[PDB]
Amino acid sequence: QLHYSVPEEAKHGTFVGRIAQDLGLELTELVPRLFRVASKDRGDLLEVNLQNGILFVNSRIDREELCGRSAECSIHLEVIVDRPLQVFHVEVEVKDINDNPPMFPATQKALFILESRLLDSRFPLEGASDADVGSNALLTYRLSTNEHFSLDVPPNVKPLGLVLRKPLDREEAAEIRLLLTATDGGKPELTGTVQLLITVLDVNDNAPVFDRSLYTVKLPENVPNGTLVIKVNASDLDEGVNGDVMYSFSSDVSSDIKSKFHMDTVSGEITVIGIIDFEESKAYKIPLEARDKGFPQLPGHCTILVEVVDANDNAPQLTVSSLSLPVSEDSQPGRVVTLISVFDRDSGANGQVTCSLTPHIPFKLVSTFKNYYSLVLDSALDRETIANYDVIVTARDGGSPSLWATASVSVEVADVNDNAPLFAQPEYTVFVKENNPPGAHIFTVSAMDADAQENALVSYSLVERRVGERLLSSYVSVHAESGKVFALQPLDHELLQFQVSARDAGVPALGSNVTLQVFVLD
Amino acid sequence: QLHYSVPEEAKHGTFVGRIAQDLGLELTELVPRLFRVASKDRGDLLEVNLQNGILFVNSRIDREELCGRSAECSIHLEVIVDRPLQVFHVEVEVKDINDNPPMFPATQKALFILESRLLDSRFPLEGASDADVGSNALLTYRLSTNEHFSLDVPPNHEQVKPLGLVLRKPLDREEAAEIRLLLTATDGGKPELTGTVQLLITVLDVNDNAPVFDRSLYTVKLPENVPNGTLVIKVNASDLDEGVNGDVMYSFSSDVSSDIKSKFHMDTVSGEITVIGIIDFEESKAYKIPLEARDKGFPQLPGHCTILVEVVDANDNAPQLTVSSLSLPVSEDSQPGRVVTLISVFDRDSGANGQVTCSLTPHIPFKLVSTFKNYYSLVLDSALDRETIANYDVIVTARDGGSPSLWATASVSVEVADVNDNAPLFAQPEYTVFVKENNPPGAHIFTVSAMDADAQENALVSYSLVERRVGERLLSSYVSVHAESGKVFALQPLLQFQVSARDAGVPALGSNVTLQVFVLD
């Protein structure tokens, strides 16, 4: 019937069309007959002036306000004239102009993506809104050139996705900034921009690592209660709770190790809580584990080997063996007497021992094997001059400070018959009473020795002599046990000299005789 | 010194050496003189028989009991003889035989390793212990042939640091839940003894699998007038993890509109979408809803899926119509084909129930016709008459199609205006009267009557007189009449005249009736 095309948002009084002459009616007819024009929507967008008989724009025309995002827009206007009654229906189609730019819901939007997020994972992103319809509507999206991310759009309606091309890391890149540009295909060309500032969330993917797998620490033997050994330090590359670690022992530690050593969980300092002995254990090997606070927590392992240094804290324990009581006087030099065994609990320089004895002593000490010493006899010996020795043996434990261990040994010398029984002085003379009764003691001879026991035993005897052959009698009788001389005859008148022999009882028996004389002629 | 070599743990009374003749001593001296042999440690390991003067093993010799894990083992025996006193020291070195196998601290050891463990990561393992000393001590480790793991041992020395298991290829819980391996430690001695430890390592589930739907987008159709709490669709998320990491919670995305949240709600556990508000097609044609689902794991991964729901236009609105251009007068002379009033029909609904069908009374000369779109004009056809038909009340019925169909009726009152097209008619022509003989002046004689079919001024009867030949003769104008009433007055003691009845309308129409009076007295 009739179609008019009018551009959106036109100048006031914009020429639409000569509707008057188009319907075969003159202005002259238009003036008297009642001219009515009615339309839907606003109905005041267009109006006709009768003076020149034309149709024109009165107010601003917003197509998107009336028809929204619909493909076709047309305004139905009816024209009524009276006397006579006549009605004509005319439709005016509104043309869309690119006056509406691509508008994003927000200029700035921040997204949060985990670090451990794998590739091919897409993230939903809201598109820009546009009230325009057709070619002058947004169709082209352009993402900033980035290494990690790429853009993806469904060909149809559906939120566009952001795909992770390269893996992300918090430590390398804490924050990532991108810009998304949406451009519509219209004249003039309009701009849409949204800047995305995405922050990388820390994921516990860094295990705690020590400086080296093994550490070596020297430790004294007699360290007091609560002595520091070493503090271990672990490095972690995460943030906050994932970045700090607690130190602890491994579950495979020995009971003794746990008994002697302890570690503070927070500090990671190793302190001694038990008496450690070098003789008990020379060194300790301790496995250590450190764990962070993150839920997927990773452990860090390192083993400390501590060595205990031997301090001279034990005196050289020695034992006297093979106790030999007798030592003969005639013993030639080079004869062993007793045995000595010296041992030391300590080890090393303060483990070796040097033994010695009294210098003012004929005996000398010499060792044959290891720390076993044998007491050998040197120089000559005499029982009578010196009876017994009480030798004190000193054992020196080297190192600083040096220790001492002494032993008292009692050794006695055995008597050997090498002396002879000697009377006081030769010779002896006595004078007996004239009328001498029988069985009367006249004199008691005496002898003394230097030896002991049977070697010092004096046995008195008499000699026979020629005068005995002269036949007076068996004369005097002597007592071997006492040395008393007994007479059994009255003296008569008609020089007596006889030898009294005192002897020993030892196996090499030795004796001497003294001359005793009696003179009687009364 | 003097050296004799004896293997550890020998048979009872094993020949060691002829110590008697070796020390320059005859049997003759050996028998009576006390011949003593004494040693530290046990001191009962060796003893000499005097009958033949020889040295032999008396008790079991355990080298590991005496020297432990030391390189060199030697027994110091001292020989004491009396009369005269003489002492001879002899050392007997014990040779080690491989009688102690490589022993691990435990036959079975279980390790717990995370799935997310990166490559080149090593795990500490304790080595095997051995009481043997020398060549017959363990130095060689052999790990079971495994794809994922490889063995690592420090070369400087053994028992300096625990040997490690290094991850060559990454492991996964879903593919391999458990891994069993065997570690064999072999010492270099003859014969060779082996020590073994069986490792049962378990793979720990790590939340590294994101929840995934069947497809990114789903399409569901939904009616318009759905009641409060109507189910739309149930969504399904698939997860490949274990336990708390394997089950997911359903929720809306944070980017949803407030209206969307107002019209739709979702159960977190089930993942079912239900409507809790009245949705209207005129309000919104379709809804696009983003959905997010998150698992219970500490490193929780999200899953996104968008539901597109379409609203169907249901006939719940009657076609709103308005009567326009109200025209009260309608002339009788109006030619057929001529429009009367205007009707404007609009419908809120769209589609099959958007189209409207109008109609009018079938028993009526009027017809309804549309020229453009859904704009209708009521046009008059055929002739009409005021007197025959006084007024019309046109009822327009509008039917809204679809199931069920809607109805909208309209009553329009139109009246036709009277037009003078009829003529005043007397009862019957003609009329004749006889006047009194002795007639007085100014006397009423008769009252004429006339009637019309029209209305108002057109039905107004006005009585008048004609001149006539008798009147022209100038005798008189005869009777004088009142136009309003039609009364005839006589003023005098064969008369034929015409009484003309006329209208009062602008197009005046009239008719004449013959009136006669007879008086000759």
Ligand SMILES: *[C@@H]1O[C@H](CO[C@@H]2O[C@@H](C)[C@@H](O)[C@@H](O)[C@@H]2O)[C@@H](O[C@@H]2O[C@H](CO)[C@@H](O[C@@H]3O[C@H](CO[C@H]4O[C@H](CO)[C@@H](O)[C@H](O)[C@@H]4O)[C@@H](O)[C@H](O[C@H]4O[C@H](CO)[C@@H](O)[C@H](O)[C@@H]4O)[C@@H]3O)[C@H](O)[C@H]2NC(C)=O)[C@H](O)[C@H]1NC(C)=O
């Ligand atoms: C060698 O030193 C050992 C500790 O080292 C010292 O102490 C620390 C604190 C530092 O100052 C350091 O520099 C020192 O050198 C020492 O071990 C100690 O032994 C005593 C008893 O023998 C313990 O006393 C008990 O303590 C517990 C507390 O337990 C703690 O254990 C660990 C420590 O890290 C952690 O889990 C906590 O921090 C705990 O605090 C008490 O609970 C307990 O009392 C209970 O029993 C009594 C009696 O029934 C009740 O009345 C109470 O209510 C309690 O129920 C004891 O008092 C002492 O804790 C322990 N020290 C450490 C650090 O564990 C060792 O004895 C020293 N060697 C020798 C030979 O003495």
Ligand SMILES: *[C@@H]1O[C@H](CO)[C@@H](O[C@@H]2O[C@H](CO)[C@@H](O[C@@H]3O[C@H](CO)[C@@H](O)[C@H](O)[C@@H]3O)[C@H](O)[C@H]2NC(C)=O)[C@H](O)[C@H]1NC(C)=O
């Ligand atoms: C283990 O040793 C390290 C270093 O000796 C200790 O690290 C301490 O804290 C920070 C850790 O990052 C060290 O570096 C610092 O980093 C900040 C970051 O901004 C920087 O501003 C500093 O200038 C410094 O470079 C820092 O050197 C060190 N500080 C102290 C007082 O120790 C760590 O504490 C040790 N482990 C334990 C358990 O103490």
Ligand SMILES: *[C@@H]1O[C@H](CO[C@@H]2O[C@@H](C)[C@@H](O)[C@@H](O)[C@@H]2O)[C@@H](O)[C@H](O)[C@H]1NC(C)=O
């Ligand atoms: C989801 O649907 C299940 C049935 O199909 C299953 O899920 C899909 C994704 C595939 O993994 C297929 O192999 C499965 O058999 C139901 O068993 C399950 O109950 C549904 N989910 C819920 C929460 O009910």
Ligand SMILES: *[C@@H]1O[C@H](CO[C@@H]2O[C@@H](C)[C@@H](O)[C@@H](O)[C@@H]2O)[C@@H](O)[C@H](O)[C@H]1NC(C)=O
């Ligand atoms: C619809 O009902 C709403 C209340 O819903 C409540 O929660 C849902 C999940 C159902 O279980 C229901 O039984 C509960 O009472 C009202 O808040 C809302 O106003 C209602 N809308 C209407 C009546 O248009």
Ligand SMILES: *[C@@H]1O[C@H](CO)[C@@H](O)[C@H](O)[C@H]1NC(C)=O
């Ligand atoms: C008595 O002693 C002297 C002293 O030399 C000795 O000559 C003499 O032989 C001894 N007498 C006897 C009987 O041996």
Ligand SMILES: *[C@H]1O[C@H](CO)[C@@H](O)[C@H](O)[C@@H]1O
């Ligand atoms: C919007 O589009 C224009 C060109 O159409 C650019 O100049 C602008 O920077 C943005 O990309």
Ligand SMILES: *[C@H]1O[C@H](CO)[C@@H](O)[C@H](O)[C@@H]1O
């Ligand atoms: C879109 O993006 C550009 C680049 O960031 C801005 O300059 C503009 O103002 C809008 O935010």
Ligand SMILES: *[C@H]1O[C@H](CO)[C@@H](O)[C@H](O)[C@@H]1O
């Ligand atoms: C060293 O000290 C000890 C202490 O008993 C003595 O017995 C020994 O004789 C030496 O004087």
Ligand SMILES: *[C@H]1O[C@H](CO)[C@@H](O)[C@H](O)[C@@H]1O
């Ligand atoms: C001579 O001397 C001895 C002592 O040596 C006395 O015992 C003896 O009786 C006599 O007088």
Ligand SMILES: *[C@H]1O[C@H](CO)[C@@H](O)[C@H](O)[C@@H]1O
């Ligand atoms: C270890 O290997 C040795 C041979 O080298 C076997 O004899 C032993 O039984 C174990 O399998």
Ligand SMILES: *[C@H]1O[C@H](CO)[C@@H](O)[C@H](O)[C@@H]1O
């Ligand atoms: C040590 O390893 C062997 C295989 O060499 C097993 O048979 C034994 O049970 C132990 O686990």
Ligand SMILES: [Ca+2]
């Ligand atoms: Ca616009």
Ligand SMILES: [Ca+2]
């Ligand atoms: Ca526009």
Ligand SMILES: [Ca+2]
């Ligand atoms: Ca646009």
Ligand SMILES: [Ca+2]
């Ligand atoms: Ca990292």
Ligand SMILES: [Ca+2]
């Ligand atoms: Ca960490």
